[PDB]
Write a protein that binds this ligand. Sequence first.
Ligand SMILES: *[C@@H]1O[C@H](CO)[C@@H](O)[C@H](O)[C@H]1NC(C)=O
Ligand SMILES: *[C@@H]1O[C@H](CO)[C@@H](O)[C@H](O)[C@H]1NC(C)=O
Ligand SMILES: *[C@@H]1O[C@H](CO)[C@@H](O)[C@H](O)[C@H]1NC(C)=O
Ligand SMILES: *[C@@H]1O[C@H](CO)[C@@H](O)[C@H](O)[C@H]1NC(C)=O
Ligand SMILES: *[C@@H]1O[C@H](CO)[C@@H](O)[C@H](O)[C@H]1NC(C)=O
Ligand SMILES: *[C@@H]1O[C@H](CO)[C@@H](O)[C@H](O)[C@H]1NC(C)=O
Lengths: 596, 99
Amino acid sequence: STIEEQAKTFLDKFNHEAEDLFYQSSLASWNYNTNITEENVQNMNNAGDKWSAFLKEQSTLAQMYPLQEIQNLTVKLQLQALQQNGSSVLSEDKSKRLNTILNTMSTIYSTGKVCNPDNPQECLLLEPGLNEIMANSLDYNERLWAWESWRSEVGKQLRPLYEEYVVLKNEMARANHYEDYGDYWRGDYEVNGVDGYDYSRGQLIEDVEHTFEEIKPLYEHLHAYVRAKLMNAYPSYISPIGCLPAHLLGDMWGRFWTNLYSLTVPFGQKPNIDVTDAMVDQAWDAQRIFKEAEKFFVSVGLPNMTQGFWENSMLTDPGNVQKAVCHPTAWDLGKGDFRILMCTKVTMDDFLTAHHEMGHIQYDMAYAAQPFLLRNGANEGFHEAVGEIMSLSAATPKHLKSIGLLSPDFQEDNETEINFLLKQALTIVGTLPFTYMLEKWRWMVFKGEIPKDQWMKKWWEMKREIVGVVEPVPHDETYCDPASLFHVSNDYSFIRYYTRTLYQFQFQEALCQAAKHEGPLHKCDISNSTEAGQKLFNMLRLGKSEPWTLALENVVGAKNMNVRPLLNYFEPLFTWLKDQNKNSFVGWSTDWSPYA
Amino acid sequence: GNYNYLYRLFRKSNLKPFERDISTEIYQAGSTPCNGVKGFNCYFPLQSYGFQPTYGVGYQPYRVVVLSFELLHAPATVCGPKKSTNLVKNKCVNFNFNG
Ligand SMILES: *[C@@H]1O[C@H](CO)[C@@H](O)[C@H](O)[C@H]1NC(C)=O
Ligand SMILES: *[C@@H]1O[C@H](CO)[C@@H](O)[C@H](O)[C@H]1NC(C)=O
Ligand SMILES: *[C@@H]1O[C@H](CO)[C@@H](O)[C@H](O)[C@H]1NC(C)=O
Ligand SMILES: *[C@@H]1O[C@H](CO)[C@@H](O)[C@H](O)[C@H]1NC(C)=O
Ligand SMILES: *[C@@H]1O[C@H](CO)[C@@H](O)[C@H](O)[C@H]1NC(C)=O
Ligand SMILES: *[C@@H]1O[C@H](CO)[C@@H](O)[C@H](O)[C@H]1NC(C)=O
């Protein structure tokens, strides 16, 4: 009869057939990931082509229902999600060119192999050969060689490809009534039609700058401390007044600073909180790790894992004969099928990753009552944030003592909390200026603020201004230094890590206030608290049905992302860094004083 | 995937109690006539449940048998079985033989 009922029946049929087809595609992807064989690759490609053709046909059929004659918010949200053209608005030649460019960037990044000139008989791939050198070497010229040679090969291959990529993506985005591709990415946080809780695409950049302006003193003190410690490690390369050399940050790109914990430890004489040896002594299997994680999630009041989870998940590496992807991934295959694909070792990192992926599984289970096209996070930040809060809670020494993994006579003094907070800052705080600088640079590239001949002169200028990292030698416009990273070369949004980092500590403060913890925020554990789990599950059950601003009101009581929980989390470390930086100079100079 | 089990997803009105609908006529959700083709606003009533063993417990197939008991003015003949206490003779007992 009416347009709204027609759209509701169309959405119901859509949902019904979509769930089954997504199940088939996800099961084919699972069979590829647990069994790398050519027929599984062919089945995955066939299922993906069927899924994409079905999404094309439902996008073609959804547009015939006009939006303004529908008053129900959930129906309007699903129709808005379905009616997006995607690449279909672009011409077939340019769409084929864009798909070819994305595939060849994927092959260039995945099969990029670089080794030393005059020794070409064997070379090391993108990850295993070079990751260990970047994370463990202490030699200046070896890291400089690896960094400059990999950015030479990858940038000189990818620069014309990226120049075509920006033009094609801007054409697709302006064909979809967006300002640029950056506006297309910022439209994920756009809330329209809700009174008071509306969020605009232009408000996101202002909120990111407003939060980063409060990030900046803590990052300046951390940068000064890491600069002083790297001056101790490398005597003559690092200047007291200048930026850090780029190849010394412990990773390939500077994404994380967590590989500098050995060099920048405050109290090496004090012990670590490593519980690996205790699990080795008690012979803890990975099944016991996941059962302890399930005990953690039932302690907070969340539902326990299904029988199909224990039957159908691969929680151990299969062997030499059978090949599988080693990356830990939680799979919501559809129809109540939830699995974890992780090659779990007996380490603290795999235990925290098991908690993180089971948090992903709990988030997927919570919105199982929702319709299929609303089965997502309210934004891209919440989905990772609900795993990162489990990674926060499981890593606490109180949780390790509660489950018996830590000795009951372990002395928790201030020095171990300071060095633990410094490790968490090197992991968590250090990625924030890199993320903000990369996303702001990509937004200015898509917006056309930076011409193609001036991409890199601005970029290093941004890195000195924001990240406080100086180039070893200057790079001209033949280089493509951003696109050596996985997310930018393979068309992924990058602001999800910034939003995840802030939502992580906002959720942590909200659940610790729910659990009535009376001490420091980093000493807080959310186990045994039914009310904290209920407050979590109230937001978790919504999925994408409600705006992320209303969900954040449901958790923390605020209508916007906030930076104060992060500063409250690291406040003992902030006071300690302010005490330790009395003689040294906080802040950096953009001049060429260390090396150029 | 077992596509042999189906369910009626649409119909203009709700069913009466103990009604069976086996019609395969195209559901008309819009003003336009379907004319037997599953085009715009016109969908097929019966949809399969792709029952796979790896499904969740809320999606696994369940066989349901509903027994309906009615009493009508005809003589009731479907009676539940009665038992037979071991016959005792030569004693003063309370006997119940066929009512
Ligand atoms: C993986 O694929 C091979 C190739 O047919 C097959 O023999 C093997 O049974 C598969 N393993 C699993 C666990 O499915
Ligand atoms: C919107 O639709 C859903 C399902 O179609 C329904 O449960 C809900 O009550 C509707 N809301 C309004 C305000 O009509
Ligand atoms: C999708 O593209 C078509 C042109 O092919 C256009 O008419 C339609 O408005 C677009 N959809 C949206 C939501 O803008
Ligand atoms: C989950 O909890 C329920 C209720 O205690 C229990 O019956 C069920 O066996 C549990 N599932 C598993 C896999 O242990
Ligand atoms: C730890 O506490 C002691 C006494 O309470 C103090 O002397 C010391 O400076 C503190 N160390 C740090 C890193 O806060
Ligand atoms: C939380 O609950 C578990 C299971 O009842 C128990 O073993 C653990 O000791 C509890 N934690 C605390 C801090 O009491």
